[PDB]
Design an enzyme around this catalytic site. Sequence first.
Site, PDB file in Angstrom:
ATOM      1  N   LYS A 189       0.647   3.583  -3.012  1.00 39.33           N
ATOM      2  CA  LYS A 189      -0.440   4.562  -3.168  1.00 39.33           C
ATOM      3  C   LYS A 189       0.025   6.007  -3.041  1.00 39.33           C
ATOM      4  O   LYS A 189      -0.644   6.942  -3.523  1.00 39.33           O
ATOM      5  CB  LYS A 189      -1.578   4.317  -2.182  1.00 39.33           C
ATOM      6  N   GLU A 205      -1.459   9.913   4.534  1.00 41.71           N
ATOM      7  CA  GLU A 205      -2.357  10.110   5.689  1.00 41.71           C
ATOM      8  C   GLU A 205      -1.569  10.939   6.698  1.00 41.71           C
ATOM      9  O   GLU A 205      -0.342  10.773   6.813  1.00 41.71           O
ATOM     10  CB  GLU A 205      -2.890   8.832   6.291  1.00 41.71           C
ATOM     11  N   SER A 223       0.771  -1.238   0.000  1.00 42.52           N
ATOM     12  CA  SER A 223       0.000   0.000   0.000  1.00 42.52           C
ATOM     13  C   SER A 223       0.797   1.279   0.000  1.00 42.52           C
ATOM     14  O   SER A 223       0.177   2.347  -0.245  1.00 42.52           O
ATOM     15  CB  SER A 223      -1.092  -0.022   1.067  1.00 42.52           C
ATOM     16  N   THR A 226       1.216   2.858   5.838  1.00 42.35           N
ATOM     17  CA  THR A 226       1.519   1.439   6.093  1.00 42.35           C
ATOM     18  C   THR A 226       1.268   0.707   4.771  1.00 42.35           C
ATOM     19  O   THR A 226       0.437   1.181   3.969  1.00 42.35           O
ATOM     20  CB  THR A 226       0.678   0.784   7.242  1.00 42.35           C
ATOM     21  N   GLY A 227       1.966  -0.392   4.571  1.00 47.11           N
ATOM     22  CA  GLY A 227       1.790  -1.167   3.326  1.00 47.11           C
ATOM     23  C   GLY A 227       2.231  -2.610   3.540  1.00 47.11           C
ATOM     24  O   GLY A 227       3.267  -2.836   4.182  1.00 47.11           O
ATOM     25  N   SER A 228       1.463  -3.526   2.978  1.00 46.48           N
ATOM     26  CA  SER A 228       1.724  -4.954   3.071  1.00 46.48           C
ATOM     27  C   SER A 228       1.341  -5.709   1.800  1.00 46.48           C
ATOM     28  O   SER A 228       0.521  -5.282   0.998  1.00 46.48           O
ATOM     29  CB  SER A 228       0.956  -5.604   4.229  1.00 46.48           C
TER      30      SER A 228
HETATM   31  P1  LIG Z   1      -2.017  -2.279   2.332  1.00 43.78           P
HETATM   32  O1  LIG Z   1      -2.464  -1.528   3.621  1.00 43.78           O
HETATM   33  O2  LIG Z   1      -0.480  -2.405   2.516  1.00 43.78           O
HETATM   34  C1  LIG Z   1      -2.471  -3.746   2.122  1.00 43.78           C
HETATM   35  N1  LIG Z   1      -2.095  -4.588   1.075  1.00 43.78           N
HETATM   36  C2  LIG Z   1      -2.703  -5.026   0.022  1.00 43.78           C
HETATM   37  O3  LIG Z   1      -3.934  -4.944  -0.145  1.00 43.78           O
HETATM   38  C3  LIG Z   1      -2.524  -5.877  -1.040  1.00 43.78           C
HETATM   39  C4  LIG Z   1      -2.386  -7.385  -0.944  1.00 43.78           C
HETATM   40  C5  LIG Z   1      -3.134  -8.136  -0.043  1.00 43.78           C
HETATM   41  C6  LIG Z   1      -3.022  -9.525   0.015  1.00 43.78           C
HETATM   42  C7  LIG Z   1      -2.114 -10.156  -0.839  1.00 43.78           C
HETATM   43  I1  LIG Z   1      -2.026 -12.245  -0.694  1.00 43.78           I
HETATM   44  C8  LIG Z   1      -1.350  -9.432  -1.741  1.00 43.78           C
HETATM   45  C9  LIG Z   1      -1.475  -8.033  -1.786  1.00 43.78           C
END
Ligand SMILES: *P(=O)(O)CNC(=O)Cc1ccc(I)cc1
Length: 359
Positions: free
Chosen positions: A66, A271, A63, A315-317
């Site tokens: 973004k 944010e 994320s 935050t990002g994942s």
């Molecule tokens: P963002 O707050 O960092 C969250 N991340 C994503 O939506 C994308 C994502 C989620 C699950 C898988 I498996 C791969 C990518």
Amino acid sequence: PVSEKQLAEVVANTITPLMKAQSVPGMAVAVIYQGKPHYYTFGKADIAANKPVTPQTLFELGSISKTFTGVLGGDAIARGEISLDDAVTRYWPQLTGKQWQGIRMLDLATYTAGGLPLQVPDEVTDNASLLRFYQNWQPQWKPGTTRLYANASIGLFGALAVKPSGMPYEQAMTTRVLKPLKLDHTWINVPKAEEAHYAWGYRDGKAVRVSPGMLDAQAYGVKTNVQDMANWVMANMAPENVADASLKQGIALAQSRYWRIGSMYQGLGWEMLNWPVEANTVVEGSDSKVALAPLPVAEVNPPAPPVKASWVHKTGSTGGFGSYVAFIPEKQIGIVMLANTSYPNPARVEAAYHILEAL
Ligand SMILES: *P(=O)(O)CNC(=O)Cc1ccc(I)cc1
């Protein structure tokens, strides 16, 4: 100012326990302190191949991508190509549903369209199915009333924002954002030559990398090293140093305050919270229970230009990565934490706050 040896201690003392507790394989860290980036590297990039983490190691931003989407959109605005007030339909006329009537470009960018989903359905794989999906979406709330964080929202924002340019997304991003900032190791699609630097993410013991998805580039597909990321932070914390006029403004547009949601302010990707802010406030807000929930918004019209005294973060994942970025423009300090394991949001925030607290 100095404390260099003190600084190296602060980081180690905070990160060391974190990695043990959340069992994180490797982590690249950057602390920006008085216009000087400081890099810290820990563990492994690849367990099997026993490759260490280096300042050149590529991580998946999730994320945090973004913020790039936000700046690109900002730049297009600054060029006159786009307006936040424009109807979505101006860029995608095929979106004929009566439901799209009062929705603007701003709504897509700030998650206020009225409940577009967190993710693009896995069933959507092409233009036809994409169009279909949007055409049949039934909004749960009216536009400009509720914030619902979603990829399907900002994802489209980015795709649309680049139309007037004539260049495909990845091209527009490279040309207008990466090149100028000299982010030569920031990829959407990592080249073969660079692949040796691409770390492995770790989930349920298994090594994993992000899979292709619709609107991936726009919402969560950027890959970088701690070096480019530090430079990204610096450009955002002090935009006056950016040579390109539209980029400069683009950055300001992304840090402007469009909506008020309790104690947080929604920018374009970014944010923000007013500084000073209490740790619990930041930490608490980062938990999924809050972060992913639909909440009422208060409009900021006209939008407030960037406030120096803010806590700017994201935050990002991904399935196997967990990253976090935070900076305070007023104090000229920032932090970058890139990890190859997806650990809880709250823990990333707590760790970052504590090091930054050693102001
Ligand atoms: P963002 O707050 O960092 C969250 N991340 C994503 O939506 C994308 C994502 C989620 C699950 C898988 I498996 C791969 C990518």
